[PDB]
Amino acid sequence: VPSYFGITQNDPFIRFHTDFRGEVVNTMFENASTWTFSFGIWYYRLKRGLYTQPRWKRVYHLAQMDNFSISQELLLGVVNALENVTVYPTYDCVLSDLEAAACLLAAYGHALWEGRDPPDSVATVLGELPQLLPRLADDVSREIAAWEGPVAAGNNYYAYRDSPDLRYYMPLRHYHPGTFDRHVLVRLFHKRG
Amino acid sequence: RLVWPDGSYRDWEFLARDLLREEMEAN
Amino acid sequence: DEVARTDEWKGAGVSRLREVWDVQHRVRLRVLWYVNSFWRSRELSYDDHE
Amino acid sequence: MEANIFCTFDHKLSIADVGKLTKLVAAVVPIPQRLHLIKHYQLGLHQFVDHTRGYVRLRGLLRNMTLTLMRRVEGNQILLHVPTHGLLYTVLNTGPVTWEKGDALCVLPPLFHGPLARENLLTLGQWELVLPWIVPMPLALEINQRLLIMGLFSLDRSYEEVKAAVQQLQTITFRDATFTIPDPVIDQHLLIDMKTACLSMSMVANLASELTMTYVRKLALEDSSMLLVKCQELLMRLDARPQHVSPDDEIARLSALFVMLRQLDDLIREQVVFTVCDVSPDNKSATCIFKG
Amino acid sequence: YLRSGLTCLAGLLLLWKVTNADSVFAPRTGKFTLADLLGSDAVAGGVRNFEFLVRYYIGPWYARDPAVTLSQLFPGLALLAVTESVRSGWDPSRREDSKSNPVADYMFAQSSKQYGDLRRLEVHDALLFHYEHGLGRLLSVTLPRHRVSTLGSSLFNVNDIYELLYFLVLGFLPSVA
Amino acid sequence: QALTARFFVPEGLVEFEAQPGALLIRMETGCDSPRHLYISLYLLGIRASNVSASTRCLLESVYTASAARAALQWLDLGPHLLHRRLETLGCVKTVSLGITSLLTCVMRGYLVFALMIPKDMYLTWEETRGRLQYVYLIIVYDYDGPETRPGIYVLTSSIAHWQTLVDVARGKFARERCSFVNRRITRPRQIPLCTGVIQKLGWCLADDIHTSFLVHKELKLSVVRLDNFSVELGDFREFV
Structure with a gap:
């Protein structure tokens, strides 16, 4: 029934029923006065763009341009959109990004696990991040000191050879050749077999 | 123990500490 | 829809392999360990007091 | 179709042998190849009988072969007639088993009988003529079922425990007679049959509906009769409104149960070969319809 | 799914590097507290920094709902990376070819x-x-922590790491005037 | 001698079946106006998993008529069961084409009377040619995939006694039986009936088996042929 979240070092776990984001925003807007609360200047600049049109002003109820306060509806919609950025309801994803990320990380991480309880479940893998991440950080640092950057060295990350005409995440199985050459982690993985 | 049709057999003994020397030590 | 124990068994596979001698050191044979075995889930304890 | 089969004796035909064979006219003998002309070796089971190896093997070899009727003989020539499905024919009782009006017949390999002094027919040199057994349905079904029971029980037991059970099982009493299975040694064929039996038994154990599972318990609570008392006495070592009732799912589940039980029955029921009209009062001959 | 997995693991590594480097026990520099958010009643009633987040946001949340992705757990990184890529000036149209x-x-x-x-x-x-692209620019820079902290302070009034974690988790960080 | 029978069937189903020597099946349908509809063994090939891709392309090309497509929709509508809906008539040799076609069938006789089988559908358990051979029509259900598409075969064998044939079929089809058990466990709310069904129709001499090609609308098919054939129908007997 309850949900417990205790990420803080010095604070006990919070106790809420469901929909933690919406519950937190509603409780903080209801139990205490939210008029004095002002968000960052980024939200203030977004407020000008939202106010400049009548339909958007009606939708978001943003009446005062100079006021630094942000209404509950705008924040809730922004949070919902940010959550929706990854998952698309059009097609059912087989597995979440965390599953594939854990697989790709633990494919390297298998060597140390043989000295400990072999994990047959994801939860045991999740329970060993503090003991596993330092190895990944060390090898990432070593690769950073090792790469010569045969690809364009403007930035060192993934998904850089995307075709300018293509503007969709899903393949149109088919992969354009050389799409992921610029990533350095895939280079390290291929080097390691 | 291993048994063959003619009734002959051969056998030998193990210590559990040798079989489980490291697999159980992890757990 | 759920899979049988056999398919997840075959997928999970084995990862360890050890060689053990008998008491007299007459014969040597290997043992296999399956990661999906119920033996792992039981969480039994072990000791060898002298 | 090859509606006639000729067989030729290579050995000389003494008057006694030819008379004896003349008495066998219209009996039943099997023929392997169905070819128009056949030598005298394949006539009968003597070429294939071997007490060292399984009675199950002989049962299979017999059930695979074709059936023929006998006809009157002449010098070095013996004529065999293959029956046609649906017509009416006359057959003679080869074994000592009693025959009754209106029950089916099956063909099985020979069995040991009380005196053990089986009569020898046409012992031409080292070769001999031996006939298969034509048996009415209950005895044949009982003996095949009990052979399968032998195979299923005897496995993974010492000879000492097996010794009493085999003496209990091997003897069959049927309509005032007594019979014994010759050589019930386990064979790979019996293992395949047992594997199929185990699979079907587990499947019917699984897919049976809840009402079928709990039926006898409810009725034993409700009623009390000799049949139910016997059933409980069997199950004693092992021993409300249904939360779901679904006629369509029940129909489908029972259909699956029927296909399972139909499969399990095929392991036992040998194929019919004859259906009888009324029998001569000496129990030696009968008039029958042939089925294939 | 390989692209999503690689992005998620890179984000996890960046988050670990940013957070676990400095202890959250630092003295409060902003005016943002959970007690001021709700009241004294609930806060009175209710190792490594990432270990607790493993204990709470990683295991129980995945067990209750496996379909959740990294964006569900940490909506905060979206705005930061988007603004970093805006500061880069590279648009999805040209891709280094309003x-x-x-x-x-x-x-x-x-x-x-x-x-x-x-x-x-x-x-x-x-x-x-x-x-x-914002994640790529952030990872390319040798120092992620200082740039992220400065951008958070300038854009969301993020005054402390103790509040930076809350801003990342909830996606926003209000403050008094 | 031969027991002649007479059927009517609409033109859409006929054109590839119109070659005199063919085998015909009757299919039930839940739709009220076409209470029954007549399908030849070739038309089962469009759905049979055993048929190779090229022959399936040819069959899809030929049977494009609306009535035939409706017949295939009725066939595919059946949930994991076909033998409950299919019934065997026998071999045919006579046809008159038209807006509604007329053809005759023989259910028992041996009065050219060759029976035609597609080359994809034919198998033998034995390479040794026995002088006397029986031929059977069998349907086998695959279960390892997401949903059950059926397998179709017509096979010749020298075995007559049924249980021996079931033994050899079990020996060769062990994968399908294990797949059936896997289907039973993996989807407990669903209950398949059998792994396969045996049906008997055959009496022929082995020296009179031929390999041949067949043509329709200048499209070419490879077939196997039984020439000096006799037909004897039987009951759909289910095995596991």
Whole structure:
């Protein structure tokens, strides 16, 4: 029934029923006065763009341009959109990004696990991040000191050879050749077999 | 123990500490 | 829809392999360990007091 | 179709042998190849009988072969007639088993009988003529079922425990007679049959509906009769409104149960070969319809 | 799914590097507290920094709902990476061959039925591409921590790491005037 | 001698079946106006998993008529069961084409009377040619995939006694039986009936088996042929 979240070092776990984001925003807007609360200047600049049109002003109820306060509806919609950025309801994803990320990380991480309880479940893998991440950080640092950057060295990350005409995440199985050459982690993985 | 049709057999003994020397030590 | 124990068994596979001698050191044979075995889930304890 | 089969004796035909064979006219003998002309070796089971190896093997070899009727003989020539499905024919009782009006017949390999002094027919040199057994349905079904029971029980037991059970099982009493299975040694064929039996038994154990599972318990609570008392006495070592009732799912589940039980029955029921009209009062001959 | 997994693991590594480097026990520098958010009643009633987040946001949340992705856990990184990529100036169109708020474009595309499904998916993917470009710029820089902290202070009034974690988790960080 | 029978069937189903020597099946349908509809063994090939891709392309090309497509929709509508809906008539040799076609069938006789089988559908358990051979029609259900598409075969064998044939079929089809058990466990709310069904129709001399090609609308098919054939129908008997 309850949900417990205790990420803080010095604070006990919070106790809420469901929909933690919406519950937190509603409780903080209801139990205490939210008029004095002002968000960052980024939200203030977004407020000008939202106010400049009548339909958007009606939708978001943003009446005062100079006021630094942000209404509950705008924040809730922004949070919902940010959550929706990854998952698309059009097609059912087989597995979440965390599953594939854990697989790709633990494919390297298998060597140390043989000295400990072999994990047959994801939860045991999740329970060993503090003991596993330092190895990944060390090898990432070593690769950073090792790469010569045969690809364009403007930035060192993934998904850089995307075709300018293509503007969709899903393949149109088919992969354009050389799409992921610029990533350095895939280079390290291929080097390691 | 291993048994063959003619009734002959051969056998030998193990210590559990040798079989489980490291697999159980992890757990 | 759920899979049988056999398919997840075959997928999970084995990862360890050890060689053990008998008491007299007459014969040597290997043992296999399956990661999906119920033996792992039981969480039994072990000791060898002298 | 090859509606006639000729067989030729290579050995000389003494008057006694030819008379004896003349008495066998219209009996039943099997023929392997169905070819128009056949030598005298394949006539009968003597070429294939071997007490060292399984009675199950002989049962299979017999059930695979074709059936023929006998006809009157002449010098070095013996004529065999293959029956046609649906017509009416006359057959003679080869074994000592009693025959009754209106029950089916099956063909099985020979069995040991009380005196053990089986009569020898046409012992031409080292070769001999031996006939298969034509048996009415209950005895044949009982003996095949009990052979399968032998195979299923005897496995993974010492000879000492097996010794009493085999003496209990091997003897069959049927309509005032007594019979014994010759050589019930386990064979790979019996293992395949047992594997199929185990699979079907587990499947019917699984897919049976809840009402079928709990039926006898409810009725034993409700009623009390000799049949139910016997059933409980069997199950004693092992021993409300249904939360779901679904006629369509029940129909489908029972259909699956029927296909399972139909499969399990095929392991036992040998194929019919004859259906009888009324029998001569000496129990030696009968008039029958042939089925294939 | 390999692209999503690689992006998620890179984000996890960046988050670990940013957070676990400095202890959250630092003295409070801002005016943001959970007690001021709700009241004294609930806060009175209710190792490594990432270990607790493993204990709470990683295990129980995954067990209750396995379909959740990294964006569900940490919506905060989206705005930071988007603004970093905006500071880069590289747009999804040219890709190193007008509007600077793709989030508003996605929101209005979702709100209006007249927007096509194909264009809705295109903007839904372009926002993620901008997020990934921001992550790439952040990872390329030798120092992630100082840049992220300064940008958070300038854009969301993030005054402390103790509040930075809350801002990342909830996606926002209000403050008094 | 031969027991002649007479059927009517609409033109859409006929054109590839119109070659005199063919085999015909009757299919039930839940739709009220076409209470029954007549399908030849070739038309089962469009759905049979055993048929190779090229022959399936040819069959899809030929049977494009609306009535035939409706017949295939009725066939595919059946949930994981076909033998409950299919019934065997026998071999045919006579046809008159038209807006509604007329053809005769023989259910028992041996009065050219060759029976035609597609080359994809034919198998033998034995390479040794026995002088006397029986031929059977069998349907086998695959279960390892997401949903059950059926397998179709017509096979010749020298075995007459049924249980021996079931033994050899079990020996060769062990994968399908294990797949059936896997289907039973993996989807407990669903209950398949059998792994396969045996049906008997055959009496022929082995020296009179031929390999041949067949043509329709200048499209070419490879077939196997039984020439000096006799037909004897039987009951759909289910095995596991």
